[PDB]
Amino acid sequence: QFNPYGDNGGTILGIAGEDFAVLAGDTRNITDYSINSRYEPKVFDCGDNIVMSANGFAADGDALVKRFKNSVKWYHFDHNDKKLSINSAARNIQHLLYGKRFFPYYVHTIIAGLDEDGKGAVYSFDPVGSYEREQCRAGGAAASLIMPFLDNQVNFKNQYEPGTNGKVKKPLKYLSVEEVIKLVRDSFTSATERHIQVGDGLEILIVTKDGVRKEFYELKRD
Template sequence: MVKQHGWYPYEFQSGTTVAIAGDDYVVVASDTRLTENYSILSRTHSNVYKMHNNSLLLSTGFLGDVLTLKKTLEGRIKSYEYTHNKPISTPALAQMISIMMYGRRFFPYYTNTAVAGLDSEGKGCIFGFDPVGSMTPERYTCEGSAMPLLLPILDSYMLGKNSTKPGPVKRTKEEIVKMVKDIYMAGCERHVELGDGVVIHVLTKDKGIETDVHALRKD
C-alpha cells in the first residue's frame, strides 16, 4: 500500500490589523491575541511594527514569515539610508517591500501585509500587498483573521457603501480612533480569534506616533 507524505511549512496565527489614512494623519490598529488551532499563545502580541519615524508595518499570518520579513526589511532600510544618506520615505518603503515579495514569489511569505505612514507632504498613505508583491495604494485597509467581519463596516463608514447615504465621508482623527475601537469591540463578539486588546497608533507629522491600548474581551 502506497502512503503519501505531504509537507506544509506554514501555520496561520491569528491577528487582525486596520489602517486608515487621513489628510495629515494615519491611524493603525492591531488586536493583541495570538492563536494557533484555537489555542491562545499570547494575549499581548501586536501585529504592527515601527519601521522608522514615519512608517508602520502591518503584517499577520504565519508569525515565522512575519518576523523574517520584518528582520530582512530592517536590514535593507539601513542599507538604503546608508547609500542615499536620507531616511526612507513610506512610498519608497512600499516599493522595497513589493520587490522583496516578488523575489520570493515561488516560495512566498505567508503574510497579509500593508505599510502605513506619511508621504513627503505629511499626508497619510497606505499600501497593501498580495503574497507576490503586487502593490495597491489604499485609503484604508483591513487584513487578518477577522477581516470578513470588519471590512464591510469600514466600507460603510468610510465610503457609505450599503448605506442610505452613499459616498465618501470625511472624518476627523478623533472620530476615526473611536470608530476603530468600536469595530474591534464588535468584532470580538463574533470572532473567537479576536480579543484581549487593541493597540491603536496615531501617526502625525507634528507629534510622531501616539499609542493607546484599549481592552477587549478575554474569553
C-alpha cells in the same frame, strides 16, 4: 509530510486621514484552538514615520518586518541618511515579497505613514507583493467582518442624501483622528464578538508629522 506554514490568527486595520494615518492590530497570538499569548505585538514602528504589520503566519511576518527594518537601515547608509518616503517603502516591500514568489510569505502586509505632501497614506500587499494605496484596508482573520463596515462608515458607500430620491450621494470628507479611533475600537469589539481568533487586546499606532504615538485598549479574553 512536513508543512512549513501555520496560521497564528490575528487581524489588522489601516485607515488614512487628511494629515494622519492609523495602523491597528489585536495582540492575541493563536495556533488551532489554543492561545499562545494574550499580548504579542504585530504592529511595529520601522523608523522614517512608517508603521508596518505582516499578519498571518507569525514566523513569515516577523521575518519580513525584520528584513524591511534592515532595508530602512541600509537605505540610510547607501543614500546619505535620506528619509524613505512611504511610496518608496511600498515598492521595496513588493520586491521583498516577490523575491519569495515560489516559496511565499503567508502574510497580508499593511504599512501606514504620510506621503511627501504630508497627507495620510495606507498601502496593502498580497503575499507575493502586488500592492495598492487605499484610504482604508482591514487584513487577516476578521477582514471579511470589518471591511464592509469601513466601506459604509469611512467611504459612506450605499448612503444617499435623505429626500434626494437616492440621486445625490452622501458627500465624502476626511474624518478626525478621534472619529477614526472610534471606528477602529468598534470594528475590533465587533470582530471580537463573532471571530474566536480575535480578542485579548487592541494596539493602535497613530502616525502624524509629530511622530508615532501608541494607544492600548482591552478586548474580551474568551
